[PDB]
Design a binder for this molecule. Sequence first.
Ligand SMILES: Cc1cc2nc3c(=O)[nH]c(=O)nc-3n(C[C@H](O)[C@H](O)[C@H](O)COP(=O)(O)OP(=O)(O)OC[C@H]3O[C@@H](n4cnc5c(N)ncnc54)[C@H](O)[C@@H]3O)c2cc1C
Length: 451
Amino acid sequence: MNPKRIRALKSGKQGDGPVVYWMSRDQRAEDNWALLFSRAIAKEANVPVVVVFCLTDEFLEAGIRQYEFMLKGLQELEVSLSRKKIPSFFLRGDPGEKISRFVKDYNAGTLVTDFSPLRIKNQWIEKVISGISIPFFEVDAHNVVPCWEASQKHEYAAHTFRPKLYALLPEFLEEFPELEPNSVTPETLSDVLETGVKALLPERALLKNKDPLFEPWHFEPGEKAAKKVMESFIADRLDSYGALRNDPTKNMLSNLSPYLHFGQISSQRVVLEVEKAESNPGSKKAFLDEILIWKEISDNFCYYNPGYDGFESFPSWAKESLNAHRNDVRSHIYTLEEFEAGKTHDPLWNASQMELLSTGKMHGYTRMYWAKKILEFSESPEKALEIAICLNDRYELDGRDPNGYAGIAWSIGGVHDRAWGEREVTGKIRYMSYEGCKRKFDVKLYIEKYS
Ligand SMILES: Cc1cc2nc3c(=O)[nH]c(=O)nc-3n(C[C@H](O)[C@H](O)[C@H](O)COP(=O)(O)OP(=O)(O)OC[C@H]3O[C@@H](n4cnc5c(N)ncnc54)[C@H](O)[C@@H]3O)c2cc1C
């Protein structure tokens, strides 16, 4: 285990009870440096490792679609951890109260968590630090290169982050040891799920017919399903990925993001397996650029920019340009509700929103298109950011994620982009025209599918 993957969050006085892994972002038993590090600390302290997960109060800010995907994954995780003789505890409430109380009730010796750069995770961490007296570590289990090691700062372009990340892959891209079971064995999620579904139901996304919009069969949740999606991608989709990743009418992406978001599969795992695959040269470079460079620069962005969801984090050239065009008359303005129902005058935009509504995963190419039009048809960049985040986090299975904040900030604010030709309203932000998409893929066919 490379000690550069683990960081101290708070010194303390070690207790003599179990080591507690507060699982949050990496909801898997295999390929999990945070669990592996926790198991190892336990072994040196001659105590078991246990897993705690907090079912937080914020679940009512998203939908059934994410709550069910996540909890059906955790049901499977319970079984897997128990086979390793690792108990798991699911705490209804927010971490400050529930983790601090768990630590005390169970006499935890050491507390470990996984790494998320999101504001809510840091809020949770502050409240836990004030409720405990034992040592508290975090482990980057989501990036191949620990986020605080990849760069010491915000990287303004993929081309400045790329050479730093690739210079560290020889060290950090490595196989995973097997998780050692514990020596000995030291409200069901079903009922939790039902309680939570009851609370969510009034806000469920319904057609006018009251029929639910969401189709829950496009991505089966859990660690075992994630691995099959990974295996089918490498076998059937990787070869064509370079040619087809920008064609939303084709189903040729990996479809791994919902699994990667909740940590039901390790990206380090996916990279290991892609690296060993013999596939079309070009396709592997393209995929690895997305799952290494662009995914891990998103953690870089959220980690070094506390205002990652606000206009103030845009590059100076984009803030200046959007400000210069802030009083340009927009050709249309849409309300949040009009965006949300796909009721604009742009049928490609509406189709993209319909794909989000019905499957919980909008094709990566039309996400770019979709966020850029929110900029073009809202009162201001700040309002555009709020609308894009709202809809992305409400309806994307892979939402509430650094990739999301960074992808929206790329779209609307030019983060990790350069200035392009000056237009009214959108200024020098990269523009993606309708006619452009028409020359790129079969727009009429995409609209047909999602209408
Ligand atoms: C406006 C906008 C919002 C986005 N919101 C999210 C979000 O909430 N959550 C999310 O996980 N991704 C987000 N993305 C990034 C990207 O669209 C998705 O990760 C991707 O479409 C998921 O499909 P896939 O797994 O089939 O992708 P693939 O093309 O197979 O890529 C494999 C993995 O690479 C990573 N990746 C790919 N593209 C990007 C990218 N542009 N930025 C960062 N990582 C990337 C993801 O982890 C993805 O699962 C957003 C992009 C934009 C433009």
